[PDB]
């Protein structure tokens, strides 16, 4: 299920909003959206 990335060690970012943001919903919002896509 989990993906396979090339760079094995993860990178700290400047967190530019000028770039694209990175999938920033936590596990609560994931489980809630699971319930909303369910019902």
């Amino acid at each position: 299920s989990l993906l396979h990335t090339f760079w094995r060690l993860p990178v700290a970012v400047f967190f530019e909003p000028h770039e694209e943001n990175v999938l920033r919903c936590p596990e609560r919002v994931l489980r809630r959206l699971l319930e909303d896509a369910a019902v």
């Binding site: 760079w7 094995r8 060690l9 993860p10 990178v11 700290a12 970012v13 400047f14």
Partner: protein
Amino acid sequence: AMEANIFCTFDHKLSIADVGKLTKLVAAVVPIPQRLHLIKHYQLGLHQFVDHTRGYVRLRGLLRNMTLTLMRRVEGNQILLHVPTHGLLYTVLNTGPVTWEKGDALCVLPPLFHGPLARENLLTLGQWELVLPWIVPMPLALEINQRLLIMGLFSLDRSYEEVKAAVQQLQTITFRDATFTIPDPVIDQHLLIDMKTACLSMSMVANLASELTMTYVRKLALEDSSMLLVKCQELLMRLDRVSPDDEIARLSALFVMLRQLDDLIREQVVFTVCDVSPDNKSATCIFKG
């Protein structure tokens, strides 16, 4: 008024043929140990430092802090040497092997041929023998120092055939009309000591750097605020695919083995060319020291 020169005497007797040979070198580069005002003739060049068990790299160490000078006028009993200053232009003779061009960076370099030599016709005395460091362009000096360090790094395993091919194709240099070759640092399978110290310190800083940086980025991975450290240790995890006193002594050894390599990893350009006279035996180089 006169100019701030260095008088130089000659203790041995001088003949008219020797003065006629000496007056070819009007504006020639000459090194001096310390800038006094009356020097003897045993302090004109590197023949006070020519030795058997020591070789090229010791001469490079002595030459880089030697206070060089230019001859001005030859006459009876006295040789007027001119001390060049930073920011004036000076005529300088090309006693070297290669012609220069307009704009080449020029630096001193000891002669590759020792006292035993068949091609020299220089100022010769009963024991004293005038030698003179060449001035080559800085790409040639970098290439000579680099190729000599590489073919001195193979001073231990000359039994094999492929390393003989590597050294004998590395024994020569390729420059502008130059099939010039440089002699081997290995003489009869024992190495001069300071070349051994140079390549030993090279391998030592290499092995220390390749061993301790992984432990230090393990200790550094908690302060990660910039995007450089993660790829810095991604390199170390890519390569494979502790008591405090020992690493303290290791780090001090790292910096001192680096600090003994300043003569090799850098050197300063001495002259630089403003123009080249016709027939390429002279140039009017502005000093830069």
